[PDB]
Amino acid sequence: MATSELSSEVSEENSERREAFWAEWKDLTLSTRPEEGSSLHEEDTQRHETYHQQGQSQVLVQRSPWLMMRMGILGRGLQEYQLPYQRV
């Protein structure tokens, strides 16, 4: 329904050297898929019975300046990738 957008911020300063540093970024975005997105449906023509179910699933994608992403469906586990993404 409504995508959520979470932001993280960092603000550091050094008065001994007069140096500062800022940062703000789209840290975590949480989205909502429509139930039609993951459904199940079964027909038994021998016993004349049918079953149907559908449900929303919320996806979670996270990121960071330190080059590392995180993603998954909320309820299932998250997966962690190493940006500049390679292969094994």
């Binding site: 993280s8 960092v10 603000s11 050297r17 975590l28 139930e35 179910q53 330190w66």
Partner: protein
């Protein structure tokens, strides 16, 4: 070299299920070691405003634990580190979701062929959060509980008791269960022999 506080790993957002444990964690470097303090929505954090919180800061590793979070706990969380050279703030969000689940039929309707004049009992078992709204239907028309067609609820077990079945009662019966995050449907066929 006195070294102003700095983050090698700042706070990062956290999403988590109502009732679970949420955890903010960050690594801080500096010298002399900073005085760290945590905030929520601008107000300082304490056992008083967040019952059961746990805090720790050893070996460059800062960590704040909230035991049994509740929706009301959502908001911006800050960590501040200072010392003679300077300071540092790292800010992140905590969003808590309701633990929800689409309607599920643990026991589904079942087709049955019976004898005219029989008592027939069709029953399902349904779970959901939020509680599903459950209704019964015959051939697309919603059934209205009554003495001849008795619908009753017992825990998460729903029942339709047809006192006296006849051939006019034959057809496709179905039960629909809906809630804010989904819906499920179980249909079966009832044959009444004359």
């Amino acid at each position: 070299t006195t070294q102003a506080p700095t983050f090698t790993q700042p706070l990062q957002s956290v999403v988590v299920l109502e009732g679970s444990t949420a955890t903010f964690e960050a690594h801080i470097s500096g010298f002399p070691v900073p005085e760290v303090s945590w905030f929520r929505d601008g107000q300082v954090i304490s056992t008083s405003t967040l019952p059961g919180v746990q805090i720790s800061f050893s070996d460059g590793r800062a960590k704040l634990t909230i035991p049994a979070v509740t929706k009301a706990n959502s908001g911006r969380y800050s960590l501040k580190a200072t010392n003679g050279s300077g300071q540092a703030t790292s800010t992140a969000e905590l969003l808590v979701k309701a633990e929800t689940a689409p309607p599920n039929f643990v026991q589904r309707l079942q087709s049955m062929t019976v004898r005219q004049g029989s008592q027939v009992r069709l029953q399902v078992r349904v779970t959901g959060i939020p509680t599903p709204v459950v209704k019964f239907y015959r051939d697309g028309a919603e059934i209205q509980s009554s003495l001849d067609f008795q619908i009753s609820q017992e825990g998460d077990l729903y029942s339709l008791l047809i006192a006296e079945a006849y051939p006019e009662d034959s057809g496709t019966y179905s039960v629909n269960a809906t809630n804010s995050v989904g819906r499920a449907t179980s249909t079966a066929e009832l044959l009444v022999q004359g």
